[PDB]
Enzyme design. Structure first.
Site, PDB file in Angstrom:
ATOM      1  N   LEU A 171       0.810  -1.217   0.000  1.00 55.21           N
ATOM      2  CA  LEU A 171       0.000   0.000   0.000  1.00 55.21           C
ATOM      3  C   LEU A 171       0.845   1.269   0.000  1.00 55.21           C
ATOM      4  O   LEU A 171       0.497   2.253  -0.662  1.00 55.21           O
ATOM      5  CB  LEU A 171      -0.952  -0.019   1.200  1.00 55.21           C
ATOM      6  CG  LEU A 171      -0.376  -0.154   2.614  1.00 55.21           C
ATOM      7  CD1 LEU A 171      -0.078   1.204   3.238  1.00 55.21           C
ATOM      8  CD2 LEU A 171      -1.316  -0.956   3.499  1.00 55.21           C
ATOM      9  N   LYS A 189      -6.639  -7.932   5.558  1.00 51.68           N
ATOM     10  CA  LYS A 189      -7.716  -7.902   4.574  1.00 51.68           C
ATOM     11  C   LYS A 189      -8.695  -9.046   4.792  1.00 51.68           C
ATOM     12  O   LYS A 189      -9.915  -8.857   4.709  1.00 51.68           O
ATOM     13  CB  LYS A 189      -7.142  -7.960   3.162  1.00 51.68           C
ATOM     14  CG  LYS A 189      -7.005  -6.610   2.507  1.00 51.68           C
ATOM     15  CD  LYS A 189      -8.274  -6.273   1.757  1.00 51.68           C
ATOM     16  CE  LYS A 189      -8.089  -5.070   0.866  1.00 51.68           C
ATOM     17  NZ  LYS A 189      -9.082  -5.079  -0.237  1.00 51.68           N
ATOM     18  N   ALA A 195      -6.605   3.440 -10.572  1.00 52.16           N
ATOM     19  CA  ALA A 195      -7.898   3.919 -10.102  1.00 52.16           C
ATOM     20  C   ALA A 195      -8.428   5.029 -10.998  1.00 52.16           C
ATOM     21  O   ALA A 195      -9.620   5.058 -11.320  1.00 52.16           O
ATOM     22  CB  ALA A 195      -7.783   4.402  -8.657  1.00 52.16           C
TER      23      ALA A 195
END
Lengths: 759, 759
Positions: free
Chosen positions: B77, B94, B198
């Site tokens: 991340l 997660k 994204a």
């Protein structure tokens, strides 16, 4: 396969939720802080550590307790090749077994790949996820190549259990059998039926163990596998190819043989060729779902035959569940890079040695009055024996220690064995200070009820732990006969003493003393003699009083209050106290908790409650815990003025007067006592911090009902009770439903109490 | 990153057991039959079924609720490439999030492979194990190729959440914002900072949603990405290459723009170029761990600016946790072969519509007095909103329905939504008959305590469910102001009625009737007037008595017994009864269970116990359950003769005299009542079968203590109580610690009771 059994299996696998496994968290995830720590931005902090040191990955992730069960669905247990998706339930069941028997988390994986090289590539790619690999249901001969390549290439231990575990069990069984019949490993002759990988691994282990290659015979469906029979035969098969002698059939080589092994199919062997080999045959049938022969046939044609099957309904079952979880536990707990043959030899030795020891309570109860002593009828331990982990895992860990494959060495084995035991018995973590203190100086304990099976098992386990010096009361004939029946090893007069109640040389003094004590309570001399003949509890109490013992544990048959009355009459209260109480331990999600009073007083007043509270606090202090007391009622800090709440308030003021340093508050609701936030919302300045661990009830109704309901609902169903406080000597009274472990725990506790000079 | 925070994270990940996950069974594994069914030979039976039909694999295995989280550790991340073993805790977190928020079992997998083709081969090989795949932390541009290849090649849905989920959330946010500022989708102009996947998925969705390609501008670190800027630039980057106009810098294209998007880095945007674009900017900062700009700067330089960040401390956080578990839930519950853009559009619409609705209790409590009504400050739902699953999953399932990718179609959506709700609230499965019966004919319910926040939330949720017609008592100004403060949507006079206690036109009749009732109990006329002014409970009781209402729910502030006294005085006992009782529901491992009596009688006698038992049996019958009663005591079937046990025996004989068809036995211990085997061992011919579901205690002490301790220890901590029985009108009295859900449950239960003519 029975249609009703099929329906039962389908319904078991279906309802109420499909599948057999589930993934659950081990941390709280309620607040926002839990989210912050378990994910961004908190989760980054440990990750960097793993970047700096890979070994620390064994320290913040489940990698140290994670095992992969990988299959392709080509060699299912009895279905051959059916597809991995068809085989998934088998791996789910294997993982369930792993978790049940060794506390190991597993991932079951089905790989739809038939090329051995691609299979190897996938498995080698999946390395960082797991800490160990176990293969399953891969057909020969690809399994050997895949296992060898992965073992050479991958940096974590790998098994094919069907290839190794059966070999371990069979090796242990045959070694023990050779011990039984007193035949040397050198001159025994080996005959093998079938080419199953288990057989090959068996010969590998036996050769590595001491069996000589010139005494072995390997026979496939083509007969004797001799050198030069065919040039293009398998190299692994070639390794056991013998110099030709003209023999071609299994009948030629079976005559004069010592051991017969078979993993090919049923009805291969017949009673005539059972007559063919030498003395004391070693029938070993591993074919499924039916064996090579019917063991009744072999035993009727020859008495001294030793028969091992793969089915539960027959004696000496070779079940793979005996090995793999424990070898994986031992390997994982030291971080072994690979599992060599040293570990397998250690496991074989552990199984062999465990086969000699005494029988455990669980298996003895399960398998009835079968002659389950060491010998031809009992050669390997039953699958459900709880000592398996404790005997196996440290041995495998030490084998890893010697060969240098370990990466996280353990300091000493004692704490390791302690941790394993705490996994097994679920109360060792709680009782460890008591056991440690008691083992320093054992005392003498009287068990008046010396003919119950549970008492005998407890005596055996106490002698083994070296925790006390028991004394039993009963008829010697019955005690000895039952000791033989249960197959224990304690010997009367050496490990424990038997007191014959029907005829003892000290009868006169005992009944005289009992009369001298009880003459003013309405006990005539004839009644005293009758009691000393008929009541074991009276004999035990008198023995303790005179100083011929140190503690007594009674009450596993009959009502509680008769035993309590006898004990109170003989001993009396300790000085400074005028009441007695009982206290039960329990394990709730908030920790260990004690409840009083549950057995003695039906409706105590304030003074009795205060004395009970003080004694309970002292007893809890014995466990090395800081006592925290709560007085419970339906009133919540004076919200009611029924007499019970007033009694609690008076008891609280009395307790605060007597012992000013004790942490206590009340009266309150149960949830306020157990939960910090609820208490702090209603009473911000309470003197009780954290969660209470002693709960005092207003009457025996509430105590008993709460104790029973919590015992069942707290899904363990285990306790340490009833501890009896207030009597002048270290005695306890149990209940008829008490198990062996509770008896052992109370014997240890009574020994600890008796170690100090009684107050 | 704070050192103390780092230490907290390490200790959280370490103690008491390493890791964050654990694999547990979902079936019993105690007896030998459990072993036989869960493994050989039982396990073979379902396997054959899978061979005959692959779809049945979705029926006996966890494949229907299993999701894989696969990573290679190259795009963590905020750490780039650090190695998969370093990234393992991220996937563990997660998976924990998956289980917590959607009840989905996951396997986290780290694959040490950098070749995209070998990665694809491994993932495609692992297909039969799972029912869905979710990628994580794979660096660009390999991620696009891997995802495309797997989606084309594999037969189960695949996501790269960082590529899709952020796109979903951003699309919903910007669509809602365009709704707010009333700007048409056609003429809005788009400016993009950064080349994060994204962003590309965002443009794909917006174009698929209605945004026109000629109004978009894509700017990388090289400036305007126009056609012909460089020939060897990426084809995906080429897809948004615009016709050159001479502009090169982001400053040239930002002026006159409508929406700014950025996922590249901090400090890229400045307040001057914030002044550059058009009215009502759409600041959208997704960079981590710091945004492109400081939202205070943007808001101070321009008031109508809309700002979205990726950090929790700022309003309108774009957190990926809002999407992926729910899309996976919806996809898995229908067996979709793949997830197309139809599902993503449905999810976007669901998020947008949910952003309009009223605020839930949890988020309103968590986020304080912030102006959390719909608008610029609140544009997307908070992460912890419980309605997310219910609004999202059915929409995704219907999208699967339309596109034909579903393989196990659902019959109707109502049972689906019901099942999801039972997952969310943990008591819907128990209360479903009550809700179903109550929804057929709503009644009128009075809540005297109409100014509490909990009561207002309960009123909102009751109106939404269409389950009652509430009536509140209090000052209208305070009620309206608090309704505005909490951001609810119920409107006084339309959804509910307000009765102004300080000034009502029916004051005269009310106090006259109260005096007429209570004149002989020591209540003067002045006292009656004072009570009708000051006591809401009296007003509610009088309103119910006159027939202007149908039920009353009171007692969420103050002591229980004052409310109970008022209610009993006004209403009186129902005919044929001379006592009242209270009963609490609870969920133990053995099922639902009721406990009585917990609140009313301090020391009931035999007759009161019999009447309480009969009323409890009838109330349990209301729930569609077959009543089974047990009388508890410390005595076990007459083992003691204290007065309490005798009282139980007399009560049992009375009950058997009155209702001969009721299943009841006693008195017994708690474990005997709850466990079949224990009871059958001691009393083989008992008239009680199975586990009892009604428990009657001898006094309020035992009932309250047991109820509280079980409430906390049974790890749920949820109840349905106290149900009040014996009064002539359908009224209940709660406790101050009662939550919203309990209030809703009791309103429904009171409505159900009032539906029939009161007895």
């Amino acid at each position: 396969m029975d249609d009703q059994l099929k329906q039962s299996a389908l319904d078991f696998h279906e309802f109420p939720v499909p599948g057999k496994i589930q993934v659950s968290p081990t941390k709280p995830l309620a607040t926002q802080r839990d989210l912050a720590l378990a994910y961004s931005p908190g989760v980054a902090a440990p990750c960097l550590e793993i970047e700096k040191d890979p070994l620390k990955a064994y320290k913040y992730t489940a990698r140290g307790n994670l095992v992969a069960v990988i299959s392709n669905g080509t060699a299912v247990l009895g279905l051959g090749n059916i597809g991995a998706l068809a085989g998934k339930p088998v791996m789910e069941g294997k993982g369930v077994l792993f978790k049940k028997f060794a506390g190991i988390d597993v991932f079951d994986i089905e790989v739809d790949e038939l090329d051995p090289d691609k299979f190897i590539e996938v498995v080698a790619a999946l390395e960082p996820t797991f800490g160990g690999i176990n293969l399953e249901d891969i057909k020969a001969p690809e399994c050997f190549y895949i296992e060898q390549k992965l073992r050479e290439r991958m940096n974590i231990p790998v098994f094919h259990d069907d290839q190794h575990g059966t070999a371990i069990i069979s090796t242990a069984a045959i070694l023990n059998g050779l011990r039984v019949v007193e035949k040397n490993i050198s001159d025994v002759r080996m005959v093998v039926s079938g080419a199953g990988a288990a057989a090959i691994a068996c010969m590998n282990l036996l050769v590595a163990l001491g069996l000589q290659k010139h005494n072995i015979v390997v026979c496939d469906s083509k007969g004797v596998i001799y050198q030069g029979r065919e040039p293009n035969m398998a190299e692994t098969k070639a390794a056991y190819a013998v110099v030709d002698d003209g023999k071609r059939t299994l009948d030629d080589v079976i005559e004069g043989a010592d051991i017969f092994l078979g993993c090919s199919g049923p009805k291969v062997l017949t009673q005539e060729m059972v007559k063919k080999m030498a003395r004391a045959p070693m029938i070993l049938a591993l074919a499924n779902p039916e064996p090579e022969i019917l063991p009744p046939l072999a035993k009727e044609v020859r008495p001294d035959a030793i028969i091992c099957t793969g089915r539960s309904d027959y004696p000496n079952q070779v079940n793979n569940v005996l090995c793999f979880p424990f070898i994986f536990r031992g390997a994982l707990d030291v971080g072994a890079t690979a599992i060599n043959e040293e570990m397998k030899l250690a496991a074989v030795r552990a199984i062999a040695e465990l086969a000699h020891a005494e029988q455990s309570e669980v298996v003895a109860s399960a398998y009835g009055d079968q002659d389950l002593s060491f010998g031809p009828e009992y050669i390997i331990p039953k699958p459900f024996d709880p000592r398996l982990i404790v005997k196996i895992a440290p041995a495998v860990a030490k084998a890893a220690m010697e060969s240098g494959v370990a990466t996280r060495p353990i300091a000493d084995f004692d704490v390791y064995i302690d941790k394993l035991t705490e996994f097994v018995y679920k109360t060792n973590l709680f009782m460890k200070p008591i056991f440690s203190q008691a083992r320093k100086a054992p005392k003498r304990v009287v068990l008046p009820e010396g003919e119950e099976a549970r008492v005998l098992h407890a005596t055996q386990e106490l002698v083994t732990l070296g925790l006390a010096k028991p004394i039993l009361i009963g008829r010697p004939n019955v005690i000895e006969m039952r000791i033989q029946k249960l197959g224990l090893q304690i010997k009367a007069g050496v490990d424990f003493e038997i007191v014959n109640n029907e005829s003892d040389p000290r009868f006169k003094e005992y009944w005289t003393e009992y009369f001298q004590i009880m003459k003013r309570r309405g006990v005539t001399q004839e009644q005293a003699q009758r009691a000393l003949i008929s009541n074991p509890t009276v004999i035990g109490a008198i023995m303790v009083q005179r100083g011929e013992a140190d503690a007594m544990i009674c009450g596993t048959v009959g009502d509680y209050h008769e035993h309590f009355s006898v004990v109170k009459n003989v001993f009396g209260y300790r000085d400074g106290v005028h009441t007695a109480g009982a206290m039960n331990a329990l394990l709730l999600p908030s920790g260990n908790t004690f409840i009083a009073d549950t057995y003695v007083n039906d409706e105590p007043d304030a003074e009795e409650l205060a004395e009970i509270t003080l004694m309970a606090a002292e007893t809890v202090r014995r466990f090395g815990i800081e006592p925290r007391v709560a007085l419970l009622s339906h009133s919540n800090f004076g919200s009611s003025d029924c007499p019970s709440s007033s009694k609690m308030r008076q008891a609280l003021e009395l307790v605060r007067e007597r012992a000013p340093e004790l942490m206590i508050d009340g009266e309150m609701h149960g949830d306020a006592a157990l939960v910090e936030a609820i208490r702090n919302d209603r009473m911000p300045d309470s003197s009780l911090k954290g969660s209470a661990n002693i709960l005092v009830m207003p009457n025996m109704e509430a105590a008993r009902i709460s104790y029973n309901l919590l015992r069942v609902s707290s899904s363990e169903g285990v306790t340490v009770g009833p501890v009896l406080m207030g009597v002048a000597k270290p005695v306890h009274v149990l209940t008829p439903i008490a198990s062996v472990r509770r008896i052992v725990n109370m014997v240890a506790l009574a020994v600890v109490e008796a170690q100090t000079q009684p107050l």
